[PDB]
């Protein structure tokens with residue numbers, strides 16, 4: 001089972017940018033708002049955004065060394081990318097807990113991103129067809 005190439009992983013992370021999110025999951029809140037860094041660290045002490053995820057994809061961090069590429073199921077495959085997607089969503093829903101519309105946007109992105117990763121895993125690993133999907137597990 002050959003892992004996906006770094007170019008394919010970069011193309012996968014690039015496909016997670018949606019026009020309807022208007023860069024909400026791409027912006028680096030620390031670089032964009034220097035005068036609010038410390039408040040964002042209190043709420044989201046672990047940083048995550050699609051710029052960091054694209055660097056990780058490009059460098060082989062999701063598909064090299066001890067990264068889990070193919071697991072027992074689609075859901076349990078590309079675990080490092082799934083954890084990064086989950087942190088991105090957790091940070092957004094925690095920060096926006098009082099703004100329901102922006103929580104719903106983060107949940108919409110979560111479902112969308114795990115489905116994009118599920119379909120990508122299936123394109124590279126037909127032997128995982130029919131197993132648990134990340135879109136069924138992550139919520």
Ligand SMILES: CCOC(=O)Nc1cc(-c2ccc(C)c(NS(C)(=O)=O)c2)nn2c(C)nnc12
Nearest residue numbers: 020021022024025092096101102103104105106
């Ligand atoms: C100081 C002003 O701050 C903000 O405007 N903040 C945020 C704004 C938006 C936002 C804007 C425009 C649109 C069209 C949407 N999409 S929708 C209708 O689905 O909600 C969302 N999202 N957002 C998210 C996530 N997290 N923070 C923000």
